[PDB]
């Protein structure tokens, strides 16, 4: 028994959105409510059943306005399904690239950063970590509403470190130094990725370390190189961005501090605005 269990029959697949090295995702319909949902699938695909079922177990435990919400699951018999709310505007990376910059102005970028830090702060308390914090894993809804994809959450008592298998692949340009050199992760590794996410946002979706080949990134980071302040990017935001890339984990701020910072800039920005 489980209140998240849904018979496979309640959902119909409408259109396939995009494939994934972890399971194709679909746009589907939850008949009972005539509700458009997102369906996460997995055949004898990439992941292995037990791992998938554990992700599902973890998703049932989170609830936050800035984390994609789980709606139900089909874990009893294959095919397995993870149903979530549908974000109408897709991922943040593509949104920023094709948007109207007059509408998606400076206060809107600050607002978006505030919503993400909010989700991460919460994830830090409930002892969670996101395996890949990046713009490609942030979804957008109506009115500049941004949420973090929840399928990438893992259990890790906030403060502890995880060691990934050997030979595993990482999204290099978003990975902290401790992970590139020793395959170690912590909520602090997420803080480093957040800094890179802030940069994708300030540049409207530009790729990190332009022209720098993946093989040369770590050596540069070591000798103290860091991406320059983007054009138009407020200095205070760049300082946080820089505090996030401190070479030493325990030197990077917490998401509790980061959310406090953005909260402050977003309000004082809404004031000078309406004024």
């Amino acid at each position: 028994y489980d209140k998240w269990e849904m018979e496979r029959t309640d959902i119909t697949m409408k259109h396939k959105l995009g494939g994934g090295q972890y399971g194709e995702v679909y746009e589907g319909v939850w008949k009972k409510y005539s509700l458009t949902v997102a369906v996460k699938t997995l055949k004898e695909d990439t992941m292995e059943v037990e791992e998938f079922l554990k992700e599902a177990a973890v998703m049932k435990e989170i609830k936050h306005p800035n984390l994609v919400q789980l709606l139900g699951v089909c874990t009893r018999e294959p095919p397995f399904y993870i149903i979530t709310e549908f974000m109408t505007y897709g991922n943040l990376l593509d949104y920023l690239r094709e948007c109207n910059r007059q509408e998606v102005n400076a206060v809107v970028l600050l607002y978006m950063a505030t919503q993400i830090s909010s989700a991460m702060e919460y994830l830090e308390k409930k002892n969670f970590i996101h395996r890949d914090l990046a713009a490609r894993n942030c979804l957008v809804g109506e009115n500049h509403l941004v949420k973090v994809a929840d399928f990438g959450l893992s259990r890790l008592m906030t403060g502890d470190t995880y060691t990934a298998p050997a030979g595993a692949k990482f999204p290099i340009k978003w990975t902290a130094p401790e992970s590139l050199a020793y395959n170690k992760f912590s909520i602090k590794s997420d803080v480093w990725a957040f800094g890179v996410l802030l940069w994708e946002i300030a540049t409207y979706g530009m790729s990190p370390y332009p022209g720098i080949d993946l093989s040369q990134v770590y050596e540069l980071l070591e000798k103290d190189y860091r991406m320059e302040r983007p054009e138009g990017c407020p200095e205070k935001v760049y300082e946080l961005m820089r505090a996030c890339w401190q070479w030493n984990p325990s030197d990077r701020p917490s998401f509790a501090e980061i959310h406090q910072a953005f909260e402050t800039m977003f309000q004082e920005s809404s004031i000078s605005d309406e004024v």
Binding site: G167, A168, K169, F170, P171, I172, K173, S179, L180, A181, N183, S207, L214, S215, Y218
Partner: peptide, 8 residues
């Protein structure tokens, strides 16, 4: 482009 890779 090229995003995922094994550390060096």
């Amino acid at each position: 482009e090229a995003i995922f890779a094994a550390p060096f």
